[PDB]
Amino acid sequence: AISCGAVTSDLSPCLTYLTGGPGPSPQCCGGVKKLLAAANTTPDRQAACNCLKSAAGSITKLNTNNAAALPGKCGVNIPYKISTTTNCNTVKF
Ligand SMILES: CCCCCCCCCCCCCCCC(=O)OC[C@@H](O)COP(=O)([O-])OC[C@H](O)CO
């Protein structure tokens, strides 16, 4: 497992670019790597994603476009097509 508070917090500086703002900024990428670097386990990734998935539902300016390219533009391994409708609960490590 992991700390949900750390999941969304790590995307603090990313929220901007994720909300349609400019980016991904250099300060944002820093957290993205730390967040993904932590989710090395199965139960760690499921919670991490789900955590952001819920906190994203309460957002109206959420730009799914910046969310998918967020980890990509930051040079990160993610063969996933990034789908907010995807069940992160059925994901492995
Ligand atoms: C790291 C693992 C892979 C990530 C997969 C990425 C694909 C999904 C990305 C979809 C977008 C999710 C992120 C939304 C941005 C965000 O979560 O901001 C955090 C902020 O809204 C606070 O979240 P909270 O602490 O849960 O606060 C919730 C409160 O209801 C909001 O008013």
For the chain, percent helix, then strand, then coil, each to nearest 5?
A: 55, 0, 45
CA-based max dimension of the chain = 32
C-alpha–C-alpha distance, residues 37 and 91, integer Å: 16
Contact 1, 44 (CB under 8 A): yes
Peptide bond into 71 cis (omega under 30): no
Burial of residue 55 (number of CB atoms within 10 Å: 0-12, 13-18, 19+): middle
Domains in the chain: ranges and CATH: 1-93 (1.10.110.10)
C-alpha–C-alpha distance, residues 31 and 14, integer Å: 8
Report how this structure was experimentally obtained: NMR
C-alpha–C-alpha distance, residues 55 and 37, integer Å: 20
CB half-sphere exposure, 65, CA atoms < 13 A: 6
Number of residues in the chain: 93
Residue 71 CA, ligand 1 centroid: distance in Å: 14
User: For residue 52, what are its two tokens?
Assistant: 């952001």
The SS3 of residue 41 is coil
Ligand 1 contact via 56 beta carbon (within 6 Å): yes
Ligand 1 contact via 58 beta carbon (within 6 Å): yes
